[PDB]
Amino acid sequence: QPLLDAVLANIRSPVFNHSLYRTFVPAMMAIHGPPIVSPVVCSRKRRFEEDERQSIPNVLQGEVARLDPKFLVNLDPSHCSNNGTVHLICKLDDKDLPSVPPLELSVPADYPAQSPMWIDRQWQYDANPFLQSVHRCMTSRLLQLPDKHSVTALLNTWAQSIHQACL
């Protein structure tokens, strides 16, 4: 109901801001009498330096941390400074039969995409009969993942397919 102050403060468009001070500060300083209402001292040069200048996209680092001791990823001759940021060599060292490591070059780690690279498909999979069956079912299974994720999801799918087509 007492919209008078509201409409006046809204009408007060001009740039000069000293009327509110001279109009209110006397009354408040008379009633409230703090010589230092905020006696804490504040003199701050906030930012000195904040950069490691050696970090790859941190989101990928989280996944490489969450990886199981069975998996292990690395880096090849890397076109992966900051944008691609990955084309790894993940050897699925586990209890069952081993295989050939894929590249899995992923996009920016924000991940509005997935990894799959499929580089060494040409000679590695056609050469062996078992490796040929490994690729077969694994492609069909990867054509099912809705928006797969780079390290954990794709690596686990690869291991599961490798140890499932093994039969």
Binding site: Q1, D5, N10, N17, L20, Y21, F24, V25, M28
Partner: protein, 266 residues
């Protein structure tokens, strides 16, 4: 006599009104600090004004409470303050009252907190049963009576509002072996093992057995029986069923969490 809560709420509302006026007139003492696109201070101004209006409305609503201040000038408190001037040389009585209230509340909270005690394990009287039964029967709408027909076994019987009486047997402590039966009973001249029902009180008997096996405390069986009785008292309505509909099945009841809902949903 719940006027204390209303008075505390009114005190808080007045303090909030004062603080809101102070905040409004302290923020109005400062213009737009740094906008660089559009003065967003009008939003904070409108918010503070709406907060003042909210506090005024809260005070007006609390005005509806606090019906009347009764007489009884402090309820027999004046004995030496308003009494003889010799008697009040008096603050000892008020100090004792406040200290007793604080001690009671603090001990209650401490017990409720330390209920989860770190006791590793326990290693290194047919007279109080009637008293405990009477103390439990002192509750309203819980008319019970024990018979003890065979030996020291307390073959008591309960009935709250309906004809759904429960012949809950006992063993002079940690009462067990309960059987619920509705709308007629006691055949011959004693209790029975009938357990007959309409496929509904069978679930009630199962729940009661689960409860009897659930409230097994290491000591203090009186508190155990009191908790058992206040747990059983929740079966006086049978008109609620959260997480489902009212008639998901024939029956609906399992309140171990003091909220009965449809069975087969826990």
């Amino acid at each position: 006599g719940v006027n204390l809560e209303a008075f505390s709420q009114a005190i808080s509302a007045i303090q909030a009104l004062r603080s809101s006026v102070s905040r409004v007139f302290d923020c109005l003492k400062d213009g737009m600090r740094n906008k660089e696109t559009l003065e967003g201070r009008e939003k904070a101004f409108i918010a503070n004004f709406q907060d003042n209006l909210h506090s005024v409305n809260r005070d007006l609503n609390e005005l509806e409470r606090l019906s009347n201040l009764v007489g009884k000038p402090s309820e027999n408190h004046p004995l030496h303050n308003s009494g003889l001037l010799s008697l009040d040389p008096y603050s000892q009585l008020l100090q004792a009252y406040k200290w007793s209230n604080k001690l009671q509340y603090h001990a209650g909270l401490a017990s409720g907190l330390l209920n989860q005690q770190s006791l590793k394990r326990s290693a290194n009287p047919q007279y109080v049963d009637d008293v405990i039964s009477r103390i439990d029967r002192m509750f309203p709408e819980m008319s019970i009576h024990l018979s003890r027909p065979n030996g020291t076994s307390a073959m008591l019987l309960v009935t709250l509002g309906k004809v759904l009486k429960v012949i809950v047997v006992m063993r002079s402590l940690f009462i067990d072996r309960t059987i619920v039966k509705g709308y007629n009973t006691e055949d011959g001249k004693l209790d029975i093992w009938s357990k007959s029902s309409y496929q509904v009180f069978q679930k009630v008997t199962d729940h009661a057995t689960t409860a009897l096996l659930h409230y097994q405390l290491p000591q203090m069986p009186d508190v155990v029986v009191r908790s058992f009785m206040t747990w059983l008292r929740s079966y006086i309505k049978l008109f609620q069923a959260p997480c489902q509909r009212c008639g998901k099945f024939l029956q609906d009841g399992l309140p171990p969490t003091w909220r009965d809902f449809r069975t087969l949903e826990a």
